[PDB]
Amino acid sequence: GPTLANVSELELPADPKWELSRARLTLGKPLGEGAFGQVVMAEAIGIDRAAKPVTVAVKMLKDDATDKDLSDLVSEMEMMKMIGKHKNIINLLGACTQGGPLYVLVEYAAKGNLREFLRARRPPQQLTFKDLVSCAYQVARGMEYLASQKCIHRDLAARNVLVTEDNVMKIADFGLARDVNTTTNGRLPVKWMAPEALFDRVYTHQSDVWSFGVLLWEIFTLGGSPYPGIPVEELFKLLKEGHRMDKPANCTHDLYMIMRECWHAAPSQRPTFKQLVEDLDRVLTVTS
Numbered sequence: 001g002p003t004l005a006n007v008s009e010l011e012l013p014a015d016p017k018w019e020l021s022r023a024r025l026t027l028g029k030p031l032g033e034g035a036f037g038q039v040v041m042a043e044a045i046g047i048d049r050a051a052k053p054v055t056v057a058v059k060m061l062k063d064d065a066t067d068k069d070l071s072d073l074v075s076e077m078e079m080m081k082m083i084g085k086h087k088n089i090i091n092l093l094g095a096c097t098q099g100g101p102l103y104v105l106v107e108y109a110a111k112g113n114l115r116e117f118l119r120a121r122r123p124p125q126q127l128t129f130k131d132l133v134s135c136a137y138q139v140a141r142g143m144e145y146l147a148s149q150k151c152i153h154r155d156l157a158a159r160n161v162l163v164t165e166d167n168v169m170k171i172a173d174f175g176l177a178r179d180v181n182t183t184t185n186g187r188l189p190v191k192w193m194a195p196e197a198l199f200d201r202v203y204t205h206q207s208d209v210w211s212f213g214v215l216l217w218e219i220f221t222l223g224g225s226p227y228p229g230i231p232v233e234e235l236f237k238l239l240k241e242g243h244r245m246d247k248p249a250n251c252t253h254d255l256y257m258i259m260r261e262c263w264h265a266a267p268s269q270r271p272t273f274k275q276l277v278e279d280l281d282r283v284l285t286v287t288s
């Protein structure tokens, strides 16, 4: 394991193809902090091919970092190395791993997370129906790609989708993602989680489909909190008895059918991401 408890240097293996030299990065304004790191805007030279600086997001350790946070940030970086380029994913761009603090460079999304983006645009240019379907389609396309790369996200939610300046949706926060014992799937927020993840301690692409269903509900409620009024301690009992969230007012019947299919108890009866892309493509085309 890499450890902060060294008196020489960093103990991270070199990976030249991802390394960016430090003079080619200028750190800028803070964007915020998460569980195991902070994010700052930066400009990076020659990492997307002309010496023009590109704005990126830099994830780094917090001032109150732990040794585990180092391990976690390295693991996140290593997962992202394994995920190829896709327009609807936040991709790794580079890293500064030698000769200084650990910096993980990822694509920048100027409008922040989808959940806050939606909530900020609640009626009281509005978000239209077409905008909502477009958001859902783009996330589905991202997830279809992830699944094809044999990657389970495990933490899909509106909070973990970012929005670019040009309103492109990019799936983010790969800290829990796995390349496909008793506490397996214990770090997954239960309101977004397929029941089988906890009851059977398995996780497949079809489990991610359940989460996508919850995300769809979040989109059409403009960032509503799932299962409002129901405590996490009561949730699985209600779900086992067949309760499902009600149709959002912004959702049409056809979209609500898609959403409810994603919450089939039986994973194999949920649609695949390839099927969801097809379904949402159809909706998006008719609405234009």
Ligand SMILES: Nc1nc2c(s1)[C@H](c1ccc(F)cc1)CC(=O)N2
Residues within 6 Å of the ligand: 031, 032, 033, 034, 035, 037, 038, 039, 057, 090, 106, 107, 108, 109, 110, 111, 112, 113, 162
């Ligand atoms: N790739 C990114 N682009 C942005 C991100 S991460 C930002 C962010 C992510 C996680 C976190 F804990 C704190 C801040 C917010 C933002 O406006 N753009």
Ligand SMILES: [Co+2]
Residues within 6 Å of the ligand: 261, 264, 269
């Ligand atoms: Co069915």
